[PDB]
Design a protein around this ligand. Sequence first.
Ligand SMILES: O[C@@H]1[C@@H](O)[C@H](O[C@@H]2CO[C@@H](O)[C@H](O)[C@H]2O)OC[C@H]1O
Ligand SMILES: [Ca+2]
Length: 161
Amino acid sequence: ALFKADFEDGNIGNWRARGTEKLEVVSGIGHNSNRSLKTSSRSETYHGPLVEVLPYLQKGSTVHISFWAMYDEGPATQVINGSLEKEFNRDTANLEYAMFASTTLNKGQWKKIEADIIVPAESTGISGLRMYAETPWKQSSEVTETDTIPFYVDDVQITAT
Ligand SMILES: O[C@@H]1[C@@H](O)[C@H](O[C@@H]2CO[C@@H](O)[C@H](O)[C@H]2O)OC[C@H]1O
Ligand SMILES: [Ca+2]
Protein backbone atom coordinates (compact mmCIF):
# COMPACT_ATOMS: atom_id res chain seq x y z
CA ALA A 1 0.00 0.00 0.00
CA LEU A 2 1.11 3.52 -0.78
CA PHE A 3 -1.68 4.90 1.42
CA LYS A 4 -4.21 3.32 3.78
CA ALA A 5 -6.95 4.66 5.99
CA ASP A 6 -9.08 2.29 8.09
CA PHE A 7 -9.93 4.89 10.82
CA GLU A 8 -9.41 2.23 13.51
CA ASP A 9 -7.16 4.58 15.49
CA GLY A 10 -10.07 7.10 15.58
CA ASN A 11 -8.02 9.81 13.96
CA ILE A 12 -9.32 12.19 11.31
CA GLY A 13 -5.75 12.78 10.13
CA ASN A 14 -5.65 14.97 7.07
CA TRP A 15 -9.19 14.25 5.90
CA ARG A 16 -11.17 17.43 5.29
CA ALA A 17 -14.54 18.76 4.15
CA ARG A 18 -14.94 20.49 0.76
CA GLY A 19 -17.47 23.09 1.85
CA THR A 20 -19.76 23.43 4.87
CA GLU A 21 -20.20 19.77 5.62
CA LYS A 22 -19.16 17.84 8.75
CA LEU A 23 -16.64 14.99 8.95
CA GLU A 24 -16.41 12.67 11.95
CA VAL A 25 -14.73 9.42 12.72
CA VAL A 26 -17.52 7.37 14.26
CA SER A 27 -17.38 4.19 16.30
CA GLY A 28 -19.90 1.30 15.99
CA ILE A 29 -20.11 1.63 12.19
CA GLY A 30 -17.43 0.40 9.79
CA HIS A 31 -16.66 -2.02 6.99
CA ASN A 32 -15.88 -5.26 8.88
CA SER A 33 -14.60 -3.01 11.62
CA ASN A 34 -15.67 -0.70 14.32
CA ARG A 35 -14.75 2.71 12.89
CA SER A 36 -15.25 4.73 9.71
CA LEU A 37 -15.42 8.29 8.40
CA LYS A 38 -18.94 9.78 8.37
CA THR A 39 -19.80 12.79 6.25
CA SER A 40 -23.01 14.66 7.23
CA SER A 41 -24.58 18.10 7.04
CA ARG A 42 -24.08 17.87 3.24
CA SER A 43 -26.02 20.60 1.32
CA GLU A 44 -24.37 20.14 -2.10
CA THR A 45 -23.66 17.01 -4.19
CA TYR A 46 -19.97 17.89 -4.10
CA HIS A 47 -19.78 17.81 -0.33
CA GLY A 48 -17.86 14.78 0.82
CA PRO A 49 -14.68 13.60 2.52
CA LEU A 50 -11.42 14.64 0.88
CA VAL A 51 -7.77 13.80 1.42
CA GLU A 52 -4.56 15.09 -0.25
CA VAL A 53 -2.67 12.08 -1.65
CA LEU A 54 -0.07 13.53 -4.02
CA PRO A 55 2.75 13.31 -1.42
CA TYR A 56 2.21 9.59 -1.18
CA LEU A 57 2.61 9.07 -4.89
CA GLN A 58 5.09 9.34 -7.70
CA LYS A 59 4.24 11.84 -10.45
CA GLY A 60 3.81 10.13 -13.84
CA SER A 61 2.75 6.77 -12.36
CA THR A 62 -0.41 4.71 -12.47
CA VAL A 63 -1.88 3.63 -9.10
CA HIS A 64 -4.97 1.75 -7.95
CA ILE A 65 -7.36 3.57 -5.65
CA SER A 66 -10.16 1.85 -3.74
CA PHE A 67 -12.50 2.57 -0.84
CA TRP A 68 -15.67 1.20 0.69
CA ALA A 69 -18.76 3.25 1.09
CA MET A 70 -22.17 2.88 2.77
CA TYR A 71 -25.22 4.99 3.47
CA ASP A 72 -28.16 4.08 5.71
CA GLU A 73 -30.88 6.71 5.29
CA GLY A 74 -33.05 8.13 2.48
CA PRO A 75 -33.49 6.36 -0.87
CA ALA A 76 -33.41 2.64 -1.56
CA THR A 77 -30.41 3.13 -3.87
CA GLN A 78 -27.93 5.90 -4.47
CA VAL A 79 -24.90 6.40 -6.63
CA ILE A 80 -21.61 7.38 -5.00
CA ASN A 81 -18.61 8.63 -6.96
CA GLY A 82 -14.90 8.58 -6.28
CA SER A 83 -13.30 11.75 -7.64
CA LEU A 84 -9.99 13.61 -7.85
CA GLU A 85 -9.39 17.30 -7.19
CA LYS A 86 -6.31 18.55 -8.94
CA GLU A 87 -4.29 21.73 -8.50
CA PHE A 88 -1.58 22.89 -10.91
CA ASN A 89 1.11 25.54 -10.38
CA ARG A 90 -0.24 26.12 -6.85
CA ASP A 91 -3.20 27.98 -8.34
CA THR A 92 -6.03 27.48 -5.84
CA ALA A 93 -8.43 29.44 -8.05
CA ASN A 94 -8.19 27.10 -11.04
CA LEU A 95 -8.83 23.59 -9.71
CA GLU A 96 -10.02 20.73 -11.79
CA TYR A 97 -12.07 17.69 -10.94
CA ALA A 98 -12.45 14.20 -12.45
CA MET A 99 -14.62 11.23 -11.49
CA PHE A 100 -12.52 8.09 -11.40
CA ALA A 101 -15.24 5.63 -10.39
CA SER A 102 -18.88 5.24 -9.53
CA THR A 103 -21.09 2.53 -8.10
CA THR A 104 -24.74 2.22 -7.11
CA LEU A 105 -25.14 1.39 -3.47
CA ASN A 106 -28.08 -0.21 -1.72
CA LYS A 107 -29.20 1.41 1.53
CA GLY A 108 -27.27 -0.18 4.43
CA GLN A 109 -24.85 -2.21 2.26
CA TRP A 110 -21.08 -1.56 2.04
CA LYS A 111 -19.67 -1.56 -1.40
CA LYS A 112 -16.26 -1.02 -3.00
CA ILE A 113 -15.51 1.87 -5.37
CA GLU A 114 -12.25 1.40 -7.27
CA ALA A 115 -10.20 2.27 -10.38
CA ASP A 116 -6.74 2.81 -11.76
CA ILE A 117 -5.78 6.47 -11.85
CA ILE A 118 -2.99 8.33 -13.51
CA VAL A 119 -0.84 10.70 -11.46
CA PRO A 120 0.10 13.54 -13.89
CA ALA A 121 3.79 14.06 -14.61
CA GLU A 122 6.08 16.61 -12.91
CA SER A 123 6.16 18.71 -16.10
CA THR A 124 2.41 19.38 -15.83
CA GLY A 125 3.17 21.54 -12.76
CA ILE A 126 0.68 19.34 -10.73
CA SER A 127 0.84 20.60 -7.10
CA GLY A 128 -2.20 18.89 -5.49
CA LEU A 129 -4.11 15.70 -6.10
CA ARG A 130 -6.88 14.89 -3.64
CA MET A 131 -9.18 11.99 -3.58
CA TYR A 132 -12.76 12.46 -2.45
CA ALA A 133 -16.21 10.90 -2.44
CA GLU A 134 -19.38 12.63 -3.49
CA THR A 135 -22.78 12.06 -5.11
CA PRO A 136 -23.27 12.66 -8.85
CA TRP A 137 -22.72 16.20 -9.89
CA LYS A 138 -25.46 18.59 -10.49
CA GLN A 139 -25.96 22.25 -9.43
CA SER A 140 -27.31 24.11 -6.34
CA SER A 141 -30.81 24.81 -7.81
CA GLU A 142 -31.40 21.14 -8.78
CA VAL A 143 -30.07 19.68 -5.46
CA THR A 144 -32.49 17.52 -3.50
CA GLU A 145 -32.42 15.72 -0.20
CA THR A 146 -31.73 12.27 -1.81
CA ASP A 147 -28.57 13.83 -3.31
CA THR A 148 -27.24 15.11 0.05
CA ILE A 149 -27.68 12.14 2.27
CA PRO A 150 -24.97 11.41 4.87
CA PHE A 151 -22.57 8.60 4.07
CA TYR A 152 -19.65 6.60 5.43
CA VAL A 153 -16.30 5.68 3.92
CA ASP A 154 -13.74 3.16 5.12
CA ASP A 155 -10.81 1.00 4.09
CA VAL A 156 -9.34 3.62 1.74
CA GLN A 157 -6.36 2.22 -0.05
CA ILE A 158 -3.93 3.20 -2.79
CA THR A 159 -1.66 0.57 -4.27
CA ALA A 160 1.15 0.51 -6.88
CA THR A 161 0.50 -1.26 -10.24
O1 LIG B 1 -17.80 16.15 -9.55
C1 LIG B 1 -17.13 17.42 -9.56
C2 LIG B 1 -17.65 18.29 -8.46
O2 LIG B 1 -17.27 17.79 -7.18
C3 LIG B 1 -17.03 19.71 -8.62
O3 LIG B 1 -17.66 20.60 -7.57
C4 LIG B 1 -16.87 21.66 -7.10
C5 LIG B 1 -16.22 21.18 -5.88
O4 LIG B 1 -15.45 22.16 -5.25
C6 LIG B 1 -16.23 23.34 -4.88
O5 LIG B 1 -15.35 24.32 -4.31
C7 LIG B 1 -16.93 23.93 -6.12
O6 LIG B 1 -17.84 25.00 -5.77
C8 LIG B 1 -17.76 22.85 -6.83
O7 LIG B 1 -18.29 23.30 -8.06
O8 LIG B 1 -17.44 20.28 -9.93
C9 LIG B 1 -16.86 19.56 -10.98
C10 LIG B 1 -17.37 18.11 -10.92
O9 LIG B 1 -16.66 17.27 -11.84
CA1 LIG C 1 -12.68 0.88 9.65
